Amino acid sequence: EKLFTPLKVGAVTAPNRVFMAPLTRLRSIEPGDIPTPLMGEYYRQRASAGLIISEATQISAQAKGYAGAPGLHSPEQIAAWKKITAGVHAEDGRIAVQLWHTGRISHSSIQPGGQAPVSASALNANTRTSLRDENGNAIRVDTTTPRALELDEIPGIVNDFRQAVANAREAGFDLVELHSAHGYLLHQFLSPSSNQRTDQYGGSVENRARLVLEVVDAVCNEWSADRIGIRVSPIGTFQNVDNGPNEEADALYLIEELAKRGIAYLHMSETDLAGGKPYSEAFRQKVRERFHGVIIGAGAYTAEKAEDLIGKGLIDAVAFGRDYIANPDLVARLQKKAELNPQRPESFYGGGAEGYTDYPSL
Ligand SMILES: Cc1cc2nc3c(=O)[nH]c(=O)nc-3n(C[C@H](O)[C@H](O)[C@H](O)COP(=O)(O)O)c2cc1C
Ligand SMILES: O=[N+]([O-])c1cc([N+](=O)[O-])c(O)c([N+](=O)[O-])c1
Secondary structure (H helix, E strand, O other): OOOOOOEEEOOEEEOOOEEEOOOOOOOOEOOOOEOOHHHHHHHHHOOOOOEEEEEEEEOOOOOOOOOOOOEOOOHHHHHHHHHHHHHHHHOOOOEEEEEEOOOOOOOHHHOHHHOOOEEOOOOOOOOEEEEEOOOOOEEEEEOOOOEEOOHHHHHHHHHHHHHHHHHHHHOOOOEEEEEEOOOOHHHHHHOOOOOOOOOOOOOOHHHHOHHHHHHHHHHHHHOOHHHEEEEEOOOOOEOOEOOOOOHHHHHHHHHHHHHHOOOOEEEEEOOEOOEOOOOOHHHHHHHHOOOOOEEEEEOOOOHHHHHHHHHOOOOOEEEEOHHHHHOOOHHHHHHHOOOOOOOOHHHOOOOOOOOOOOOOOO
16 A cells, blocks of 8 residues: 555655545635635645645636635735635645636626636637525526637736735645646647637647746746646546647647646646546556656546556556545545545535535544
8 A cells, every 4th residue: 555655745745645636615705705714624624635735716806717716816815825724734734726717617797897708719618607696505607708818918817827826825835736627728728629829829739838838937936846736637528628639649748848847746637527538558657757746646536546556656646526525534534444424416516514514534
């Protein structure tokens, strides 16, 4: 067994390789998209994780795509997050904030001025997002057709990521994870299916990867490369966003480029919740030899699978999502081979303490 052995992850050292995957729970306060004391308790209960990766958090107001998602751009938000990281550290844990811009997966009613959301192109995501009704309850609503970002608006996006990382540092986070997966803004530029731009930000894989790499350089410069992690979902289809006709080659290109920056880790989201083709060991080997930092595998993993891949030297750690929603002390349970609490999907999004902080520990 190696899941319970130490691992150096950038600037910090995890005591085990069982990580908590980023999980949107939509329980923040509005107006203000402010983290709450309840959220602080939720994270504190899971502080035994090798590393906690927070729910996706807005780098700006424009970045908001769901009612209830927190931000990390205002004074009130920074003050709230400082309390949450402090709680995690009080329990000797480590926490990374996942920073994102939802792009076209949003709705005009929650955008600044009630205007249309932005993306690489003016193409509707053809999916749904979550808003809140008059009672504060979560509701699914179709996404609003986005406006294509103009060339001179790109630097502003990079700067928002840069500022959010500076904010993350002050808020006490140990690391930052750039959300470059699951069909959100960065992935929208990476995928040819959602990117029809004719400037230097569209077309070739070099052009499509330009935005995410500019962000990576900006945040490494703002803080430090060993504090930066990135999540990608380069193989398969996620929330209607595929990875083009040459996904494997494009994936390896991106990974080689990320490797040049010497960042802390590469978080590979292997499958959409609806499923996808499994990674071949040959592909894992090609990824392995191209990145020199920590590699985290994710997506419907079993403890057995994690041990198998870590043992083969293909990945270093595994991020569990839904199992962490239902098991605050997942590390102890996996170590003792104890049964897990059953999941209650109806309370994954919105609401309050029920289905959030009421899953018991052993
Ligand atoms: C409720 C819910 C919220 C999610 N929100 C996030 C998120 O904020 N950011 C992210 O990158 N993925 C998110 N995911 C995906 C998870 O991180 C994870 O990759 C996925 O659940 C598959 O892993 P699992 O089988 O261990 O749950 C979410 C999934 C669920 C079920
Ligand atoms: O519906 N959800 O709230 C949701 C949200 C995010 N996100 O980054 O905040 C995801 O990445 C996913 N996802 O791809 O699993 C789902």
